[PDB]
Amino acid sequence: TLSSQDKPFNLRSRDPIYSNNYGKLYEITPEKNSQLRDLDILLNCLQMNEGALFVPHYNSRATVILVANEGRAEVELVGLEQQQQQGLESMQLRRYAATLSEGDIIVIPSSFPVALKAASDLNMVGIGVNAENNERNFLAGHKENVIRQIPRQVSDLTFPGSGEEVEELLENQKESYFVDGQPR
């Protein structure tokens, strides 16, 4: 990496977008890097400890492919299948769970909620396609929780309980993105 700098000169890291304890995530986007900028990819590095659930989320635009560099992962993907189907209830609700592992690849469509589990100490690379514009919305955790935004009156109407009862259930988890997977 030479001082005659300027090309398709190589790239690597910056402050993770989600560091923590339980785990971290670094992520080069297209809007902040030119060799991908015109490539439309998002690249991202995901590191976690024995047992740190990446908590339910879904990317808005990007479709991310993930490879297991190092470790053992338990992925749990969630779905509604093909609209060459034409019937609401007549659809599917599927859960795709795989314990991936050094070698394997998981494809992760753009709105389908995902959650991971770091069975071993994990190193994962993310090659996101359909980048420009992606947002990650969370359904659990303390920062960027979205179940935490539906106003009160609506929550009552929406979830099997109530306004006040959602708002609790919700912050009964003072942690961010990667949290404790410790079962019972």
């Binding site: 969630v78 609401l88 955790g141 109407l157 959602v166």
Partner: protein, 181 residues
């Protein structure tokens, strides 16, 4: 819905759900029988009509939608991970709903009923649109439902028993409901 040469005339959307207060209809895939429309192959159109003082529960779609007000007036709600942006729509209002943001939509105080048109620009799955709903209903349940006991235990830090009493359910007249107030 099936095998016509070059017909540029459409009048039948298939219904996604319908009930006492409203309806959501979806047009046959443009590139359907005719080959005369492969350039539209990606677009989709949904019509929508709710009786006065009703709700479209919170949901997000994989497709970018361009909402447009044909009749009524609406209160649209765009939810993102930091707050909301809310809007009073009027006959002729057109708003652009990005993919994946959840939104709920409401017909106010009225007598006047709500008719909205949704032009959908698809990507993920060309000419295929999919919405996801938080709440459980008889059509389908929460996506949340799909997870694992522990997955919901860890994430939430609440026993499953208390996850499902704000998870699975009986919201009956389904995705469109009558509001209290």
């Amino acid at each position: 819905a099936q095998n016509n040469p070059y017909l540029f005339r459409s009048n039948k959307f298939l219904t996604l759900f319908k009930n006492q207060h409203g309806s959501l209809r979806l047009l046959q895939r443009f590139n359907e029988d005719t080959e005369k429309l492969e350039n539209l192959r990606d677009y989709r159109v949904l019509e929508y009509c709710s009786k006065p003082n009703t709700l479209l529960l919170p949901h997000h779609s994989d497709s970018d939608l361009l909402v447009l007000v044909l009749e009524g007036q609406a209160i649209l709600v765009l939810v993102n991970p930091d707050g909301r942006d809310t809007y009073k729509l009027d006959q002729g209002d057109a708003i652009k709903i990005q993919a994946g943001t959840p939104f709920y939509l409401i017909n106010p105080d009225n007598n006047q009923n709500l008719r909205i048109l949704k032009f959908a620009i698809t990507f993920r799955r060309p000419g295929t649109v999919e919405d996801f709903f938080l709440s459980s209903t008889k059509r389908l349940p929460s996506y949340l439902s799909a997870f694992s006991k522990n997955f919901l235990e860890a994430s939430y830090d609440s026993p499953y028993d208390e996850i499902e009493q704000t998870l699975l359910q009986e919201e009956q007249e389904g995705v469109i409901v009558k509001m209290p107030k």
